[PDB]
Amino acid sequence: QPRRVSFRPGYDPSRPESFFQQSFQRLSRLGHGSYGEVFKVRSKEDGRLYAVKRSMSPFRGPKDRARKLAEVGSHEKVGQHPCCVRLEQAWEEGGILYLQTELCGPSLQQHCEAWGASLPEAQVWGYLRDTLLALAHLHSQGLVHLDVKPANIFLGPRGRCKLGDFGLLVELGEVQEGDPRYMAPELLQGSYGTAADVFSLGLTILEVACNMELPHGGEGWQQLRQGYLPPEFTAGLSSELRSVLVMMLEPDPKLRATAEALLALPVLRQ
Numbered sequence: 001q002p003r004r005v006s007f008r009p010g011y012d013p014s015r016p017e018s019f020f021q022q023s024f025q026r027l028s029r030l031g032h033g034s035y036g037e038v039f040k041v042r043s044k045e046d047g048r049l050y051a052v053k054r055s056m057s058p059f060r061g062p063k064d065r066a067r068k069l070a071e072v073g074s075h076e077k078v079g080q081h082p083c084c085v086r087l088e089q090a091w092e093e094g095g096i097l098y099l100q101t102e103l104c105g106p107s108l109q110q111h112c113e114a115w116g117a118s119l120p121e122a123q124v125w126g127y128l129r130d131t132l133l134a135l136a137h138l139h140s141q142g143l144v145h146l147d148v149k150p151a152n153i154f155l156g157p158r159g160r161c162k163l164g165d166f167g168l169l170v171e172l173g174e175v176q177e178g179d180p181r182y183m184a185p186e187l188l189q190g191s192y193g194t195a196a197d198v199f200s201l202g203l204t205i206l207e208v209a210c211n212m213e214l215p216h217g218g219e220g221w222q223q224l225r226q227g228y229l230p231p232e233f234t235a236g237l238s239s240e241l242r243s244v245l246v247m248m249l250e251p252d253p254k255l256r257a258t259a260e261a262l263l264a265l266p267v268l269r270q
């Protein structure tokens with residue numbers, strides 16, 4: 001029996017088919033991986049198109065179930081913000097967790113691969129703005145995403161982007177590992193705060209604006225975490241963008257800029 005999942009219609013219960021196969025039509029499989037599978041679907045009760053994620057394998061034990069279900073709780077804490085992917089409903093059946101979210105466009109990672117070049121700064125600034133708006137919303141409620149990267153930012157109409165994948169989200173006041181390429185240096189010493197997301201967004205913007213593959217480790221990983229940007233790729237960057245990037249990549253989290261401060265800056269105002 002399927003049961004809804006929260007931390008706050010074609011039913012056919014008798015029929016021997018899953019609620020997913022009974023309440024929705026799988027138009028496409030947007031993606032797949034260890035997390036499971038993401039499908040493009042249209043509600044068989046509302047007709048509107050939505051995105052659904054399902055886990056690959058059934059719950060192994062009590063812990064696996066709790067760890068997976070936490071994303072629902074984390075998604076609920078984020079709430080409804082214009083620049084954050086909104087969750088409609090979440091449920092479980094057969095040891096499988098399902099999350100139904102608004103259908104968004106392609107990820108910033110995909111868009112960048114297709115463009116195959118440094119994105120125009122006009123698009124870049126807007127993504128920086130909306131993502132900063134989203135982070136400020138999370139930071140105000142004592143939430144840290146910890147996995148800000150191109151793949152977790154989804155594009156929308158008229159050059160707008162929304163933040164998603166709140167699985168690694170932690171409420172300031174249990175932490176999972178994130179991608180080393182985008183992690184703030186303070187995390188190595190266990191210092192976790194909203195500043196970390198800002199640094200991740202900085203490397204995110206640097207990656208898409210200079211078509212630069214971020215280093216997983218080594219000296220290159222260090223150079224980007226010493227407050228000095230590499231002049232070889234940052235050549236085409238405008239003076240204004242570079243200054244904003246230096247603020248976000250400030251090694252010391254105590255001195256690093258905050259989202260609201262950056263958003264208040266004139267270049268990033270509206």
Ligand SMILES: Cc1ccc(O)c(C)c1-n1c(N)c(C(N)=O)c2nc3c(Br)cccc3nc21
Nearest residue numbers: 030031038051052053099101103104164165166
């Ligand atoms: C399904 C889901 C649940 C929770 C959550 O936080 C998010 C952001 C989503 N979610 C979307 N709403 C996607 C979209 N296109 O609308 C979307 N695409 C994905 C791709 Br492509 C690859 C891997 C994972 C994806 N997860 C996605």
